[PDB]
């Protein structure tokens, strides 16, 4: 739950030097890769030396070189910290001691270069009782300032507390000295400073710095392009450790082969439970209800395996879904993503107790549309049309350069969904069901707000992503997908 082992601004040489002087055999940290941006490096110390393991993420999952594939860095660390003997270098290396980071740049409450007047301006417009921030010092270079709002919602005040940096330790002028600003902040959240006149300086929540008005999107993107996108994303990534809910149902022996990737699993409290099977384990599918928080919901799931095809159609029928969104080709760069789970055009196939007819195909440039009729074998009045939107112009590397094709796609998907009475969640899948799947769903949630409320509405991209990640681990995988979400929201605003 710490995630302090991730160092955002460290190099390979600084990683070796930090592990050789402050760490011991078994100490580790994780950092961005400097040789190949977009990837990550796990730096472990063993037998008095440091080894560096490559962690790739092209948009679908974190892939440990010589290891396994994971939905988040936190889950990768947590896995190998409890599965010693599994991390192979080809000797075995252990993750014993997280080397914690003292750089507070990825913290929600850290602002850096900020004046006192501006700190009061931001805490006035967006802050409430307990909102706080930590900024670099105005009057005393090297020091820091803690600015807290206290009042009721001239009944409120902003209090500034100086934070001296003495010998690489931090203090508020008296008491204990801390090795990092994070340690000082975590101390004074649990034991808040009390003023002479009784005012308790509670540090309830950090000040929101990402919620913007939809009309300010062009300004915000220009500010994040001069880089701000990387910092805003890694601040979101630091909060994935609060989303380590139980995934025990996917870890069962009976459900191991129902996952495309053994470690990328749904949460127990949001997974799709399948009812009425055959009496072993017939209730499991690697899928999660995504509910934004009528209201449009989503089922984020993985690409189909050969042995989960029947389970897929049971889910579509049981959840009453009428629209399926497919975010990858059947085959991409020679590797099999989704297996074909639909019949050829005009053909009829039976998948277990479910019966699917491919009625018509319509081929646009960005996607293929397939009108399918799904029914339960042997029953009348169970037939419903399911519309499959197979997006096929997503590039093999990175994100699309122009978000227009994705938006027009989503616009079509949304109107067909709205046209069907009592439609269930929209199914979005392919590959591991977290990368492209999360990007499509997050864009569609934000674009939904703008479509119904116009340009005068607050959007908060990291808050929307974090809310989605609590229902399926790893939704939105890379910093390029994060930027693409902004680009798509901005492009939708401009076409209004």
User: What's the CATH topology label of the largest domain?
Assistant: Protein-Tyrosine Phosphatase, Chain A
Q: How many beta-strand elements? A: 26
Give the terminus-to-terminus CA distance: 43 Å
Principal-axis shape = globular
Query: Which quaternary structure do these chains form?
Result: monomer
> How many separate domains make up the residues?
3
Enzyme class: hydrolase
InterPro entries: Prot-tyrosine_phosphatase-like (IPR029021), PTP_cat (IPR000242), SH2 (IPR000980), SH2_dom_sf (IPR036860), Tyr_Pase_AS (IPR016130), Tyr_Pase_cat (IPR003595), Tyr_Pase_dom (IPR000387), Tyr_Pase_non-rcpt_typ-6/11 (IPR012152)
Family: Belongs to the protein-tyrosine phosphatase family. Non-receptor class 2 subfamily.
Keywords: Acetylation, Cytoplasm, Deafness, Disease variant, Hydrolase, Nucleus, Phosphoprotein, Protein phosphatase, Repeat, SH2 domain
